[PDB]
Design a protein around this ligand. Sequence first.
Ligand code: CLA
Ligand code: CLA
Ligand SMILES: CC1=C[C@H](O)CC(C)(C)[C@H]1/C=C/C(C)=C/C=C/C(C)=C/C=C/C=C(C)/C=C/C=C(C)/C=C/C1=C(C)C[C@H](O)CC1(C)C
Ligand SMILES: CC1=C(/C=C/C(C)=C/C=C/C(C)=C/C=C/C=C(C)/C=C/C=C(C)/C=C/C2=C(C)CCCC2(C)C)C(C)(C)CCC1
Ligand SMILES: CC1=C(C/C=C(\C)CCC[C@H](C)CCC[C@H](C)CCCC(C)C)C(=O)c2ccccc2C1=O
Ligand code: SF4
Lengths: 218, 41, 203, 81, 73, 742
Amino acid sequence: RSLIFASKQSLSYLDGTLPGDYGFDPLGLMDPEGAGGFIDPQWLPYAEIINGRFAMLGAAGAIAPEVLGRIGLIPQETAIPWFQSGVIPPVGNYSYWADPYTLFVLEMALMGFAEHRRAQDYYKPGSMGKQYFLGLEKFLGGSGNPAYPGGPIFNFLGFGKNEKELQELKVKEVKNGRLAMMAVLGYFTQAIFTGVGPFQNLLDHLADPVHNNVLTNL
Amino acid sequence: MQDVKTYLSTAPVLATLWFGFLAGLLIEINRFFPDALVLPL
Amino acid sequence: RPLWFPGSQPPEWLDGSLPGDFGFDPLGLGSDPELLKWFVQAELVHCRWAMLGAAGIFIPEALTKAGILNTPSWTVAGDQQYFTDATTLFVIEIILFAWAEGRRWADIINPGCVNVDPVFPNNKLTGTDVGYPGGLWFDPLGWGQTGDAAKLKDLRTREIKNGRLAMLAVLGAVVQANYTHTGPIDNLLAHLADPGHNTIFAL
Amino acid sequence: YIGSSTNLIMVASTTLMLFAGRFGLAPSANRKSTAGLKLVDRDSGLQTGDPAGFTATDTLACGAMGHVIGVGIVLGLKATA
Amino acid sequence: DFLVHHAIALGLHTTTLILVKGALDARGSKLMPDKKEFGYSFPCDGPGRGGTCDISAWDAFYLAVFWMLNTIG
Amino acid sequence: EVKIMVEKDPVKTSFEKWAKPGHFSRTLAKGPNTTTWIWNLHADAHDFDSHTNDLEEISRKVFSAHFGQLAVIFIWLSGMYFHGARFSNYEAWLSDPTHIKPSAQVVWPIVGQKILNGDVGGGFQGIQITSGFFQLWRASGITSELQLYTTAIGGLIFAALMLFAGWFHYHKAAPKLAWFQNVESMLNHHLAGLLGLGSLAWAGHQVHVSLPINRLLDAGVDPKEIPLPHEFILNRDLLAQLYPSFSKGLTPFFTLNWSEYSDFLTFRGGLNPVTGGLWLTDTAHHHLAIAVLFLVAGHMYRTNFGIGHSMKEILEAHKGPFTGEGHKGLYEILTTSWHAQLAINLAMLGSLTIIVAHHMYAMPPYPYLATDYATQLSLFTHHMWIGGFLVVGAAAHAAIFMVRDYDPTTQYNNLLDRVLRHRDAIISHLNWVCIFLGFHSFGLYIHNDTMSALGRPQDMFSDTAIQLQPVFAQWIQNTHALAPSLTAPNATASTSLTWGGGDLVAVGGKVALLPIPLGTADFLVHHIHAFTIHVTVLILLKGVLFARSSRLIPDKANLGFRFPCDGPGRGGTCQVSAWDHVFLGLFWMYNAISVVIFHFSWKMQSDVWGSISDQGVVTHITGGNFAQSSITINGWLRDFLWAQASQVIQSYGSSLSAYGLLFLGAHFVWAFSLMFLFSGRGYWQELIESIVWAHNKLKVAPAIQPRALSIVQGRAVGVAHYLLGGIATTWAFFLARIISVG
Ligand code: CLA
Ligand code: CLA
Ligand SMILES: CC1=C[C@H](O)CC(C)(C)[C@H]1/C=C/C(C)=C/C=C/C(C)=C/C=C/C=C(C)/C=C/C=C(C)/C=C/C1=C(C)C[C@H](O)CC1(C)C
Ligand SMILES: CC1=C(/C=C/C(C)=C/C=C/C(C)=C/C=C/C=C(C)/C=C/C=C(C)/C=C/C2=C(C)CCCC2(C)C)C(C)(C)CCC1
Ligand SMILES: CC1=C(C/C=C(\C)CCC[C@H](C)CCC[C@H](C)CCCC(C)C)C(=O)c2ccccc2C1=O
Ligand code: SF4
């Protein structure tokens, strides 16, 4: 029953059925009175899920080639920060098997075969596991809530079978999800200010914290 | 097209499509046959 | 029913009765039933001209690269000199297609009227559907006139889907000649060497 | 820089304005000034753990008036002394 | 001289147009059949029936004084 | 209480309402029966208050119409950047702009119009543009045409976004009425989010992109070898070699050592002697200051976070003994009427555009703006015409608020009720000051014409005859020149060169600016300007005040806005309507703004624009004749309307001959206006009856009955051709003369 940063306008719709329902809504964004296209109580918890899971793949992924290079498990050519890895070819470009403009077309082809399927399950649940898709359309049916399908592919260890266990574990997903969005936003501002990768930013601060903070470094 | 072609058949659109074709034709006559003051035929 | 967008509801005007119907109408231009029959007739001759187009673009240029034939590229094929001038090659073709497509114009408007040969009235086309004329001049093997309708619909679906790949291909050959200034078989072999880099973003 | 005059003004401009917004000396979200400059209580709806009524809006509002006033005192004293 | 003689013919023809129109629609017209019972130089007949500004024959004379000025100019 | 109220799918996106043209109005939904239906179809097309009585759907219509307008402006900006990218000599002009004219329009060689592709310089043929886009892109730091093409396709992307948002906020998620009635939040997000963050973002551009590129452009560096704008952001040593204050790296900003930013954030003032345009260290300090000031002003009003102002509480506490219950209900005026807010916003935008015109000839913000005289004359003239049109439209929508949204029950004994209660006093005293200004300015001109005609040059109002020196303006110009020494210390130079601080700036051998003299001629023409502005205020304010009723017609509000008259009664009630006062104020805007731009063109062609030879001698275009000829109407007809029109009429057979063609066709449209203005409906209706008889004789009668244009429509067509023809006449004469002598 922990409640922080809440208002009586915010608790009119945040009744606690959400996983990360801590009452934090000062602006009043999940109000069902003016629910529209993207500012509505059906898309916004599901938007935090997809932004949470891409940031948990993002915050872990932008530091993993830098941590693994200091301990000596990957080559130093790939042991590079995230910004000088072909993402922003101004601050640095690394030569992959393809140039990143061709890799972007390969990205949105595979994202277009993955996020269009994720899109139409939100508008109508279970309507995608009917048409033939490579003999694997039966597993891609999903639940009523489109943030958690829980099929044979997205729950392939079956972890969280109990309803009380799965609901409490959904709280740990969004709280690790929300920390990862502030990490990637923290990764973004440190890449512009410090100009060096985030694992070097942790190692610089762990040696001299009073001389390598945000105030000293730009 | 029971109503899209009805909008396309309205007076300003059909004046734009005809005079676009009409001025399009008279410009292209004035390219291959320019400075035409006397009809030779 | 296979559909182009499996979550979407199929349109009312695309009921699946047409060959190659996958419900793809986001702009809804085939909503009128009178204009839908014109557009199906427009798509049939578009499909067959592009498959005839793709056999004159990608087949002889593959034989040009393999050394089987010494034909020029498809972009510069009209620039070549022949026994008839290319300005007056058009009006021979326009006259010959005023009888080919003008008599096809009557079949779309009035079905079952131009199926009889005017010079010899005993000769006639064995066709009952608009866009599929039949007869000896167009179906000499008789594969398009079958008693069963499920096999006949799938064979017409096989004709449409083979067509619309070529309409992507001939349009693909046009933009490749405008961008790369290279024959599309040579664009394929450049892409077959290094597909990571030799793309549209190779500039 | 810690003992410099820029730090001591900007700390004290922020601290005194947060002291004024908490101890009922400044306008805040939960108390309004009328045309007579009289502090009258209101229910803004914002709920925090402060019994006086200090919320997350006021610590951003009085921090800003700790900063808008505090920038002007620092650069006012820089051009003068 | 040809072109300005057609300007002259334009001026005489349009002044004659307004003046013959004023003289022959003087008694009445399809907009207002009782123009004779309102006198010659009456102002208008009101905003009703679309609008009846300059409906009188004096107003056609008025509009053709501009046309004689343009013609003789 | 401020939060998002929208609702989902109000109207279905269908073309069946496109096919029926008059769907918005109940009278036009029955179909046409006369040819006046077509004109009321366009007249009531945008009038959303006449369609429905529900303000919610009206506000949704206005919001999506704003998005469609934004899409049209982004399409226009996409076109002007694509014309810079492909059909211009912007790189050639950017190599050296003192000899190559700015040109961004190529015509097609079809019918002899290829002579309009003139020799503008740089090995380029095209129409010489006067819109100032080249100097704007030089001030933006644009070096290549690839950046112009990228901005064009980005603007096309934003135009598609505005079209998508206009469809979205009418057919998918449209806001409700209380969303638009949150005016405190709208002002908080327009002051801080739009004008504050916009000024802050353009300040960041003018710190990183405009400033180093324009510093390298002052050094004579070729733009093909100037480093690209992101290289200053990436290689900050390259940015530090031009400004050493960048070597500290954002630590003086958070430690309040802003004076250490004195290398690139300055309060210099004046013009760059290299280019003739304002400094971008001053334009970047300007934008940073108006951003740290608009973002402060955007935290003023009360949305839903407790702190702020209810502006009804601001208004209802503003009440005085000379008014009583004033300012009360004005919040209910400005949140339930779109026309009242449109009147205020149009008055501020038109007056602001006039501010823009004066603050651009006088303080030219763009490099080589002042020395390209065509750009200066066209920018001043364009912004004066836009500003005059918007203030006449401000009075228009003020009058529409009176005739259709003014509720007298909610407005008792406030400011508006008392202004209506003494409107005879306002209009009569305005009438007196207009007649007094008319005699004491134009009769002074007539007196100068008479004594110059009668051979009495000493009996005139000259600088040599009876002097009328503007001592207040001549003192405020000395106060603005002798300011940096005592009243504004921290300034290196003065605000503008036109004040009197010297600094004869010569850029390319042509005068950018110098001290502007103010004499008897300037006094006379400023009193003409005050007179014409006052008379435009008189017709427009009379239409606002007598929109409800009059002594003549006490039931004028029931007749509406676009009604012609009551009839020939009460002596004649022709043009009693508030619309007809907007119609006459359009003519008085023509008169006012046309004399403003005429005074501008002659004043700076005589006293500012010119050339500087060796040993500091300044030869103007029309040397020194404003002080002696602009005091008589014969000088205005002779040394301005005849001497300077000696390049619009003999431009035939050259590249400027389209200005001669549009000069003559503009005279045509003006004399065509006099057909609609001087005539009336009933004559044309009976002439159309004769033509309909000739059609009945040959069985070519249309079922849509041919009708004459309505009286409101005939006046609208006449004033539209009058403004179009006269404004196009001045446009053609200006853009031929100052291109020819520039
Ligand atoms: C901080 C947020 C903010 C900002 C930046 C603006 C900005 C704007 N508003 Mg908006 N508005 C907001 C919030 C905001 N609004 C709030 C909270 C309210 C509700 C009370 C309104 C309700 C309101 C209405 C009803 C209308 C506007 C209109 C306008 C436009 C001004 C007209 C123009 O030509 O400007 C210059 C235009 C531009 C510079 C174009 C910029 C367009 C881009 C895509 C940004 C706009 C999206 C969004 C507002 C902010 C996203 C920021 C993004 C860049 C990260 C402009 C787009 C007017 C308009 O034109 O309607 C469309 C209009 O009358 N506003
Ligand atoms: C911010 C700008 C703004 C706003 C929102 C509006 C909004 C409106 N105006 Mg307008 N108004 C303004 C400013 C603006 N105006 C200005 C600039 C003026 C001075 C001219 C006025 C004067 C005013 C009056 C006099 C009246 C309105 C009215 C109207 C309403 C509907 C008009 C309609 O259906 O369009 C109709 C659109 C046309 C007929 C298009 C014609 C465009 C002009 C007149 C001619 C073409 C000019 C063009 C540049 C020349 C090209 C020539 C070429 C094609 C050959 C609507 C409320 C009317 C109303 O009833 O209000 C409720 C009306 O009576 N307006
Ligand atoms: C349906 C839909 C739905 C809704 O409506 C919406 C939308 C979207 C609109 C849609 C879609 C559309 C599309 C996709 C289109 C496209 C098309 C195409 C591309 C065609 C082509 C098509 C194509 C074609 C025919 C082609 C043809 C070809 C040809 C003849 C060729 C020829 C040739 C050859 C042999 C070779 C030589 O050496 C040369 C030549 C002579 C050259
Ligand atoms: C929990 C608690 C506590 C604590 C509290 C505190 C200590 C608080 C803090 C707070 C704070 C301490 C806050 C601050 C804030 C700040 C702000 C809010 C800021 C803002 C800013 C702005 C507004 C901007 C700026 C600027 C200016 C002003 C000028 C120009 C430049 C710039 C832009 C930068 C105590 C111990 C009592 C007790 C127990 C409990
Ligand atoms: C001329 C005139 C008319 C008559 C104006 C009319 C009939 C408008 C004519 C518009 C066009 C020219 C007719 C409609 C054109 C159609 C679109 C058909 C196209 C034919 C060609 C233009 C291609 C008035 O009604 C009027 C009313 C009040 C004061 C002054 C006047 C006035 O001066
Ligand atoms: S506006 Fe027309 S109807 Fe009304 S009084 Fe004048 S002329 Fe008569």
